[PDB]
């Protein structure tokens, strides 16, 4: 029922909280949870592994059937599939992996997919092992997304750095 609580309001449409996106999905039952996906939808590690494990592998079985018939996504692209027990829908979004040389300009394209949904629970795109500068990813979110986005960042030091840098 989109009952988000305990988020800091950064802008009129962007909110942020130090929390695990899986625990937020369980508490909130959002209409849309965003997965930090890769092009073949292999939900190993990071956000994707955590969401998939919380569905008892249902998300991986559904995603393998999608890829068999439709093929891989593009960097900056997205795919709406079932949200299983975590949300009504899961929006799988592929941000660029700059640790693998993918272009950081495609992070704006990745965030643009959020504009199709009125309200979303999401992670910080291209952060962690994808290698983008997290402060930059937050600025791209704030500049690109017009709909209501609730960012869950599961790392207190990173959350504090993002908040302090934005509040300058
Ligand atoms: C910057 C990070 C703090 C952030 N991670 C997270 N952000 C929010 N909720 C989270 N839950 C978990 C969790 C829950 N259980 N487990 C075992 C995990 C893991 N791993 C992790 C997580 C993050 C955002 C975007 C990402 C990635 N990581 N990593 C990637 O490979 C791709 O893109």
Curated annotation (Swiss-Prot):
The chain holds residues 1025 to 1192 of 7096 of the full protein. Residues 1-168 form the Macro domain. May form homohexamers. Interacts with N protein. Inhibited in vitro by GRL-0617. It comes from Severe acute respiratory syndrome coronavirus 2 (2019-nCoV). This is Papain-like protease nsp3. Responsible for the cleavages located at the N-terminus of the replicase polyprotein. Participates together with nsp4 in the assembly of virally-induced cytoplasmic double-membrane vesicles necessary for viral replication. Antagonizes innate immune induction of type I interferon by blocking the phosphorylation, dimerization and subsequent nuclear translocation of host IRF3. Also prevents host NF-kappa-B signaling. In addition, PL-PRO possesses a deubiquitinating/deISGylating activity and processes both 'Lys-48'- and 'Lys-63'-linked polyubiquitin chains from cellular substrates. It is found in: Host endoplasmic reticulum membrane. Changing residue 31 to A: In strain: Mu/B.1.621. It is a multi-pass membrane protein. It catalyses: Thiol-dependent hydrolysis of ester, thioester, amide, peptide and isopeptide bonds formed by the C-terminal Gly of ubiquitin (a 76-residue protein attached to proteins as an intracellular targeting signal).
